[PDB]
Symmetry: C5
Subunit: 68 residues, 5 copies
Amino acid sequence: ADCAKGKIEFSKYNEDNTFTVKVSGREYWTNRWNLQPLLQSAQLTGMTVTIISNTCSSGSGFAEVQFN
Amino acid sequence: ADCAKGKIEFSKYNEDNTFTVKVSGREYWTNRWNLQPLLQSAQLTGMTVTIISNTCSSGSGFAEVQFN
Amino acid sequence: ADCAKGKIEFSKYNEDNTFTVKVSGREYWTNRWNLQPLLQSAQLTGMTVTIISNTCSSGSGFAEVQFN
Amino acid sequence: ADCAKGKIEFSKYNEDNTFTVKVSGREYWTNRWNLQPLLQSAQLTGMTVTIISNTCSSGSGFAEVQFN
Amino acid sequence: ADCAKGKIEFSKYNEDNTFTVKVSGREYWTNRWNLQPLLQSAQLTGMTVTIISNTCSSGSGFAEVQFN
Ligand SMILES: CCCCO[C@@H]1O[C@H](CO)[C@@H](O[C@@H]2O[C@H](CO)[C@H](O[C@H]3O[C@H](CO)[C@H](O)[C@H](O)[C@H]3O)[C@H](O)[C@H]2O)[C@H](O)[C@H]1O
Ligand SMILES: CCCCO[C@@H]1O[C@H](CO)[C@@H](O[C@@H]2O[C@H](CO)[C@H](O[C@H]3O[C@H](CO)[C@H](O)[C@H](O)[C@H]3O)[C@H](O)[C@H]2O)[C@H](O)[C@H]1O
Ligand SMILES: CCCCO[C@@H]1O[C@H](CO)[C@@H](O[C@@H]2O[C@H](CO)[C@H](O[C@H]3O[C@H](CO)[C@H](O)[C@H](O)[C@H]3O)[C@H](O)[C@H]2O)[C@H](O)[C@H]1O
Ligand SMILES: OC[C@H]1O[C@H](O[C@@H]2[C@H](O)[C@@H](O)[C@H](O[C@H]3[C@H](O)[C@@H](O)[C@H](O)O[C@@H]3CO)O[C@@H]2CO)[C@H](O)[C@@H](O)[C@H]1O
Ligand SMILES: OC[C@H]1O[C@H](O[C@@H]2[C@H](O)[C@@H](O)[C@H](O[C@H]3[C@H](O)[C@@H](O)[C@H](O)O[C@@H]3CO)O[C@@H]2CO)[C@H](O)[C@@H](O)[C@H]1O
Ligand SMILES: OC[C@H]1O[C@H](O[C@@H]2[C@H](O)[C@@H](O)[C@H](O)O[C@@H]2CO)[C@H](O)[C@@H](O)[C@H]1O
Ligand SMILES: OC[C@H]1O[C@H](O[C@@H]2[C@H](O)[C@@H](O)[C@H](O)O[C@@H]2CO)[C@H](O)[C@@H](O)[C@H]1O
């Protein structure tokens, strides 16, 4: 499902090396290392991202994301 | 063949780690990890890309792309 | 704890491959390779970063950081 | 030898994972993956590059390049 | 010691995978792969870099650098 669509409010590198982004008031994290620079680049340019996952409650993990 | 030439409309990181880009109204995906940052950079800067592949219908894979 | 929140005044690549950033007048270092490009991008763009660690005195290590 | 010195006219990711650039009307390819993002950045900012190799005819391989 | 401080005049990817930068009229090289994208980004944006090493003559190696 499309869990959230919006700008990245903040991003955060976590101690376990996962990466959290806050979109549409909800936080989601991913363990895919390659998405770190891609998500930060979207954040910097103010691009809209769509967090895609089976679980959409805040604090959930995701591994799929559309840029624009 | 040159399947599509134009700016990337959107890109998507897939759960299976492949990467999809939509160019000239058609979607294409690649499994080449090195293309991910090159494609996202082309998207953020509005570079014109030419998706090259023997299969050009929307939903097809590719591994070759020219950046202008 | 939130050790420092501000722009990165300088970053430095160390001989042991760790990376140091100076934020709010204090220096912090991290051994997480993935953070290097993220922290440099933040520095180049003037992003506000929050260094998160249980040890916040100048010269402390960290592995967690929020980008705003 | 200095094979070509000029702006990157176009770059291309090849199916065999090599990367081609066209400079001063000639095509050069490299198998050094680390060069890909460096060459694409030079291309985006319009920086002059000097392709260095012992073989300088169009279609030759290289692994050395000066930026500016 | 602080060997040189200024903008990167040019950078060069070498055949042995090392990376050279020219700062304040002197060339320095490093074998640290991680420094490549950091040094190139510094060069592209005009950041001031300070090359730190015990050997400061042109042609010397380094593995420590500050980005301002
Ligand atoms: C001699 C002719 C026999 C049949 O022709 C081949 O048909 C297949 C269709 O099944 C074609 O395969 C397709 O090739 C394209 C590239 O031309 C794509 O493959 C590339 O991209 C994928 C995904 O990124 C992989 O990286 C492959 O290694 C790439 O080559 C497409 O996914 C693939 O189905 C083939 O081109 C015809 O020659
Ligand atoms: C009397 C109480 C002692 C027990 O508490 C622990 O104390 C130590 C101090 O010696 C704390 O260790 C410090 O933890 C921070 C993060 O909170 C830093 O460690 C992180 O960063 C480094 C460098 O990048 C490494 O990546 C570590 O893996 C990270 O956790 C700091 O460097 C470290 O000294 C500890 O937090 C307390 O629980
Ligand atoms: C010494 C043997 C007699 C002739 O000298 C050598 O001739 C060969 C011609 O086949 C030259 O090989 C060419 O070398 C250049 C660099 O000068 C290119 O090789 C580089 O780039 C490729 C592709 O990226 C690889 O990374 C190589 O490792 C690099 O060295 C070119 O592709 C290659 O054909 C050789 O230089 C002469 O000494
Ligand atoms: O003009 C640059 C060129 O770069 C890429 O091709 C390279 C050489 O130009 C080309 O001669 C060489 O062809 C070889 C293949 O390497 C090999 O895999 C195959 O078995 O034989 C052919 C010769 O028949 O390939 C290198 C790349 O390794 C790029 O593929 C090409 O489109 C063009 O951009
Ligand atoms: O990236 C290349 C290289 O950088 C660092 O080494 C530098 C020089 O390459 C190296 O020659 C030099 O060696 C010095 C020692 O520092 C000094 O203690 C000794 O007495 O004399 C030699 C004289 O050559 O060291 C500098 C760094 O100060 C880095 O240390 C090295 O690992 C490597 O990455
Ligand atoms: O329309 C593009 C899609 O690309 C990816 O899927 C492809 C292919 O289209 C599909 O049939 C196959 O099952 O998986 C491929 C990836 O390995 C994405 O996964 C899709 O979401 C579309 O973007
Ligand atoms: O002037 C800097 C040079 O850096 C690289 O060479 C260094 C060093 O200068 C040289 O003496 C040694 O043999 O190799 C080093 C790299 O491992 C480049 O190879 C040179 O072309 C210069 O750029």
